[PDB]
Design a protein around this ligand. Structure first.
Ligand SMILES: [Mg+2]
Ligand SMILES: [Mg+2]
Ligand SMILES: [Zn+2]
Ligand SMILES: [Zn+2]
Lengths: 98, 168, 193, 239, 38, 49, 49, 65, 56
């Protein structure tokens, strides 16, 4: 389509760094019987960890992306129903401006 | 059948070598020569055969012979049908798999469907179609160029004799 | 061909390709009815087909002048293939590799091919160097000349003909050249017609 | 990023609805048969049922999903420690097989996570998430994913396509330089740089693909996809 | 273990109008001179 | 003009309506086939060609 | 004389496409043949049947 | 690609009205409907003629040899 | 050529212009439209074959 374009690919590494500095409990020491509702965080299909307050983190991410600070090419989705928060740095993704 | 098809003849021993019209050659420009895939495949059968012959003639090392045998078995097999299940394919340097005898007869475009059941022909023409409310139902309008290329071989009889002379 | 009907020394005969006949221009008699498109015929040996889909592509080209008469077919992995047989059959081909001292000297071509690509030289230069070498290597006129310098001399012989400019000092550095030796070997070959 | 070790893992749920003992198995690479979930978890150091269950099911009150997993525990009953589990997986390819199992799981199992070491805990958690997701569609809680959702689709452009080609072409050169290193060390002939690096490898290599359209090597141009790279339409500006 | 340049590897084909291309930073009047269509 | 065809103004055709330029490019290589053989651009003579 | 009906008349952007009759017209009554099958050749270009 | 001499449909000589047209638009600053009319282009066939011309010649002239 | 009426024998009318001209009532069996469609002609070479054409 006219407005359409494709992703070229970003380094997920700095986004992963912001995550652990925004309250992300790492998967390695997650206890499911203790936090059975904690929202799971994904970066390019890699389960990096878990998050207690997902809404605030999401807000911080979006306002970082609209600022330019985090690439506007990067995908950021919260699945309130499935208690999931996936992110994509991935190239090949077709996007349009809104 | 005792006369035309015995079980023993399902095993090959003597190989019919097809004449060139079956497997054509083209001598281009003295450093460029084109040989048919079947000719390549026969050169492999022969090379393999010549080798096994020497092996059996000389000191037969058993396992070294059965090795050479299965290679001859392949080249022979692979020449009739190259698209064998399980087996690797005979390949022409380009990566192109060898057009076996089976391959040639095989599909729609194959010797049967594409060359016998159907065939391009002479004394045929094709152009765009347009409607003519002034033409008759049974009539077909023919562009002069086509009419001037397409022909009828009328035989000289004392009826057409004078008219045919005029056309000539 | 020549027209039976007339027969004047220079036979003025035309190829009416579109009408598919070989005709005598002088009398009008068609001498042949069967006529082939050579260019389209050649396209069954050399083509766009690498895939092996084309029912037209039925043959393969060769270079008699260089390859000689060696018709061979790779045993390779197809759509359905158990790797076991591909190994077995190729292992078998190895034992059957008992090729002559000159059927192993085609490895000197593999050297020139590796030397041309390294010299950033064209395909035509190789086919000329591999040509001049194939004609002089067995020569008595050359005898016991430094074998390393004989093939390097054929690379300059190939470059001279293909108009691809290369200095003696360039080819000298490319392999290793004993100046007087590779100047003498380049003259016996140049003398070889 | 880099090489793209495109390996697939399938976690299959056996038995149709209304059938006795519905087991859950997994497609581990370079292994003949599919292995029961509990055997993989036990091969990852998660040995009691209570732990193997925790990684899969987060709610202790989800008896519906827990009863769904009861025959998986029963199926992997025979295995009861890392060694027994690893040797089990290996035989499906002693000591020879334990190492094979250790390697397949570390190297070829969920390699998008990590290709090495201490991330067993991480690899194992993902396995549980996969099974959780599998069991959800099987309990008709969540529905089968749309195989046509454009968001789960990617478009490989000029960059990725060349990158793919160049990766194979560079590896071709790198291994031809190694072959030369042996030749020159054998005769101490001095490793002439021009004699080592064959320009033509990459030069003509890329030129082929771009010219013919068969995205791969000429070898090879039979098994490689053609259609990438076409002669540009110059009919009308819009075309 | 104890101790005892820039080499050409190949020709990469450039995409017209890319950073590496001659026509990337080219003007209208420039392209016309290069016999290229703006 | 029935069944998808159409009447066109011949007089407009003359006044230049829907005319087009057509350019076809023919290409030929003077090839070298090894040490001695070379294709040649010239006017071939019917007696020796 | 006036047409009894009134016509919907006015401008409309029309495109002259490829495919012109003289690029398509094709006749043959014998011509070149194939060497393998000895049947006619394929293509208008090649003067095939 | 140069102003056609004569309207395809009707035949009114239209090729002499170009520079004159462009003068009414730029120099006089009149709108197209007003401009084409000053030139004498009554019928829509002749109007379509000048109104729709794209003078590509000008783009071509920009290449030196 | 989907049914016997996709191939019918016709009476020639050598005419100007590069197209095969036909009557419209004949469009129905051929499944023809004058939107750039092409058709084929085959010339019988025998007095016998032309009877098969004209007769059947
Ligand atoms: Mg139709
Ligand atoms: Mg219709
Ligand atoms: Zn004569
Ligand atoms: Zn007008």
């Amino acid at each position: 389509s006219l407005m359409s374009c494709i992703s070229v690919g970003t380094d997920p590494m700095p986004i992963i760094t912001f995550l652990s500095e925004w309250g992300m409990e790492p998967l390695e020491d997650y206890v499911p019987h203790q936090s059975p509702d904690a929202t799971r965080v994904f970066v390019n299909g890699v389960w990096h960890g878990v998050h207690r307050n997902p809404a605030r983190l999401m807000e911080t991410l979006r306002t970082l992306r609209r600022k330019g600070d985090i690439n506007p090419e990067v995908s950021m989705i919260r699945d309130i129903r499935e208690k999931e928060l996936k992110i994509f740095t991935d190239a090949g993704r077709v996007y349009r401006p809104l | 059948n005792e006369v035309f098809s015995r079980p023993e003849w399902m095993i090959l021993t003597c190989l019919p070598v097809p004449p060139p019209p079956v497997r054509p050659s083209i001598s281009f420009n003295e450093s460029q020569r084109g040989e048919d895939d079947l000719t390549f495949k026969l050169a492999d059968i022969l090379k393999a055969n010549i080798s096994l012959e020497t092996l059996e003639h000389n000191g037969a090392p058993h396992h070294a012979i059965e090795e050479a045998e299965s290679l001859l078995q392949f080249h022979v097999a692979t020449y009739m049908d190259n698209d064998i299940a399980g087996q690797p394919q005979a390949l022409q340097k380009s990566g192109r798999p060898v057009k076996s005898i089976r391959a040639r007869l095989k599909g729609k475009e194959g010797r049967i469907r594409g060359n016998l059941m159907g065939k391009r022909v002479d004394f045929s023409a094709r152009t765009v179609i347009s409607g003519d409310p002034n033409l008759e139902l049974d009539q077909v309008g023919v562009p002069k160029s086509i009419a001037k290329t397409l022909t009828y071989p009328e035989v000289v009889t004392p009826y057409n004799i004078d008219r045919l002379t005029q056309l000539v | 061909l020549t027209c039976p009907e007339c027969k004047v020394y220079p036979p003025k005969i035309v190829e009416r390709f579109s009408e598919g006949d070989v005709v005598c221009a002088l009398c009008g008699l068609v001498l042949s009815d069967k006529l082939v498109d050579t260019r389209s015929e050649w396209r069954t040996f050399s083509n766009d087909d690498h895939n092996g889909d084309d029912p037209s592509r039925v043959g393969e080209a060769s270079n008699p002048l260089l390859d000689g008469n060696n018709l061979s077919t790779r045993i390779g992995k197809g759509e359905t293939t158990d790797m076991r047989f591909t190994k077995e059959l190729n292992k078998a081909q190895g034992k059957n590799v008992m090729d002559k001292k000159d059927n192993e000297v085609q490895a000197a071509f593999a050297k020139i091919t590796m030397l041309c690509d390294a010299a950033e030289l064209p395909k035509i230069v190789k086919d000329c160097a591999k040509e001049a070498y194939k004609l002089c290597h067995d020569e008595k006129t050359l005898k016991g000349k430094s074998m390393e310098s004989i093939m390097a001399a054929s690379i300059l012989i190939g470059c001279r003909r293909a108009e691809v400019a290369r200095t003696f000092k360039e080819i000298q550095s490319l392999i290793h050249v004993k100046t007087k030796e590779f100047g003498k070997t380049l003259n016996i070959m140049k003398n070889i017609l | 990023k880099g090489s793209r070790f495109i390996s697939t893992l399938q976690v299959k749920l056996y038995g149709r609805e209304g059938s006795s003992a519905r087991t859950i198995k997994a497609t581990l690479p370079y292994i003949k048969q599919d292995i029961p979930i509990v055997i993989i978890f036990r091969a990852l150091g998660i040995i009691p049922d209570g732990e193997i269950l925790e990684h899969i099911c987060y709610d202790v009150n989800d008896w519906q999903m827990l009863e769904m997993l009861k025959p998986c525990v029963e199926d992997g009953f025979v295995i009861q420690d890392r060694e027994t589990a690893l040797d089990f997986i290996g035989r499906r390819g002693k000591e020879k097989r334990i190492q094979y199992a250790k390697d397949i799981l570390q190297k070829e199992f969920l390699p998008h996570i990590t290709q090495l070491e201490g991330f067993e805990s991480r690899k194992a958690f993902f396995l549980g998430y996969m099974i959780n997701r599998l069991l959800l569609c099987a309990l008709d809680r969540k529905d089968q994913d749309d195989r046509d959702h454009f968001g789960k689709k990617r478009l490989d452009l000029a960059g990725p396509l060349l990158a793919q080609l160049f990766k194979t072409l560079f590896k071709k050169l790198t291994k031809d330089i190694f072959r030369y290193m042996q030749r020159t060390v054998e005769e101490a002939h001095d490793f002439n740089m021009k004699l080592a690096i064959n320009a033509k490898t990459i030069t003509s290599g890329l030129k082929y693909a771009l010219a013919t359209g068969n995205w791969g090597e000429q070898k090879k141009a039979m098994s490689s996809r053609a259609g990438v790279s076409q002669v540009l339409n110059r009919y009308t500006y819009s075309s | 273990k104890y101790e005892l340049g820039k080499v050409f590897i190949g020709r990469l084909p450039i995409m017209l109008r890319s950073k590496n291309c001659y026509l990337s930073e080219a003007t209208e009047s420039d392209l016309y001179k290069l016999k290229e269509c703006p | 003009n029935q069944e998808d065809s159409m009447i066109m103004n011949q007089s407009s055709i003359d006044r230049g309506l829907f005319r087009s330029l057509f350019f076809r490019s023919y290409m030929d290589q003077e090839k070298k086939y090894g040490m001695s053989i070379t294709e040649t651009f010239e006017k071939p003579q019917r007696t020796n060609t | 004389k006036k047409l009894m009906a009134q016509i919907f008349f006015g401008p409309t952007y029309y495109q002259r496409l490829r495919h012109m009759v003289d690029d398509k017209i094709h006749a043959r009554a014998r011509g070149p043949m194939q060497v393998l099958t000895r049947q006619p050749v394929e293509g208008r270009s090649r003067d095939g049947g | 690609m140069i102003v056609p001499v004569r309207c395809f449909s009707c035949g009114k000589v239209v090729g002499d009205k170009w520079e004159s047209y462009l003068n009414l638009l730029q120099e006089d600053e009149l709108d197209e409907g007003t401009a084409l009319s000053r030139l004498g282009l009554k019928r829509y066939c002749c109007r379509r003629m000048i109104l729709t011309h794209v003078d590509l010649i000008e783009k071509f002239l920009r290449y030196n040899p | 050529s989907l049914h016997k009426m996709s191939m019918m024998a016709h009476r020639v009318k050598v005419i100007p212009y590069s197209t095969f001209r036909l009557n419209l009532s004949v469009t129905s069996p051929y499944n023809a439209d004058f939107d750039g469609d092409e058709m084929n002609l085959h010339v019988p070479q025998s007095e016998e074959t032309r009877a098969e054409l004209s007769q059947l």
